């Protein structure tokens, strides 16, 4: 399948070179997989989700996304127009408030929740969790991410936007999950992206168009935007049977575009997520 005039990030993950505008992908499109977006929530009623999104848990007064961040990230995973895996099932877990903040205890609870909840859902091709959030180092937060991964969920987390070594941030610094940095449309490391030996992979993160609240769209930037590209790619690859939750991060790194990025500090991987689609 091909989507013409796609958002640049979708085109980038299906090409070996920058500058293209068509997103090429297998029609299976992640059908049969499930992705939990752990964030400010998801505006499930947005037409772009086609009834494939559902809120399953909130830690606040409402399950509504009053911020937009979660809806944007969810759109990059699996909306019709802006998504990588256009037929996946999305589940929203609201661990961040409408200002985009949240306590570590709540974020941990949300991870533990997904590890259990996935056992109540029909996701025959596998389960992914996308965490576009983080803060200063916490061994407890790292442990929660490690448990989630251990339970059989492909965990993708943002590296962070401090232009610093991600070793000092969580859950970015947990080695067992897939830690995602951001790149721009000219194949440079995004100016705000964290880096360091704990990164596993880069994905598009600057000027990413996706869904927003009130049935709208907008372009924003961050490692928060790169993370759902990788999460969606994992769901997509799982549905194709190329990899499993335990090994998807490694498979994505193995099959990545290598050496294409500029402004990567020595010691950080130069690997850009790539779907290897051949018609």
């Amino acid at each position: 399948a091909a989507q013409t005039n796609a958002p640049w990030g979708l085109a980038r993950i299906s090409s070996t070179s920058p500058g293209t505008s068509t997103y090429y992908y297998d029609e299976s499109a992640g059908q049969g997989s499930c992705v939990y977006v752990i964030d400010t929530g998801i505006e499930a009623s947005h037409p772009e989700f086609e009834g494939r999104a559902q809120m399953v848990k909130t830690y606040y007064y409402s399950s509504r996304d009053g911020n937009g961040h979660g809806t944007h990230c969810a759109g990059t995973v699996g909306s019709r127009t802006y998504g990588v895996a256009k037929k996946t099932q999305l589940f929203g877990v609201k661990v961040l408030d409408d200002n985009g903040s949240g306590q570590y205890s709540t974020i941990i609870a949300g991870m533990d929740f997904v590890a259990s909840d996935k056992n109540n859902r029909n996701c025959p091709k596998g389960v992914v969790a996308s965490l576009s959030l983080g803060g200063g180092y916490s061994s407890s937060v790292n442990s929660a991410a490690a448990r989630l991964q251990s339970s059989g969920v492909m965990v993708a987390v943002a590296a962070g936007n401090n232009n610093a070594d991600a070793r000092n941030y969580s859950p970015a610094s947990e080695p067992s999950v897939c830690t995602v940095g951001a790149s721009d449309r000219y194949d440079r490391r995004s100016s705000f992206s964290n880096y360091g030996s704990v990164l596993d992979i880069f994905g598009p993160g600057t000027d990413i168009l996706s869904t927003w609240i009130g049935g709208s769209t907008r372009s924003i930037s961050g490692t928060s935007m790169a993370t759902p590209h990788v999460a969606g790619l994992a769901a997509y690859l799982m549905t194709l049977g190329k990899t499993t939750a335990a090994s998807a991060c490694r498979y994505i790194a193995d099959t990545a575009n290598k050496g294409d990025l500029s402004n990567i500090p020595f010691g950080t991987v130069n690997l850009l997520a790539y779907n290897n689609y051949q018609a």
Binding site: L133, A159, G160, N161, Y169, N194, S221, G222, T223, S224
Partner: peptide
Amino acid sequence: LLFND
């Protein structure tokens, strides 16, 4: 510029 870590 954050949309985060």
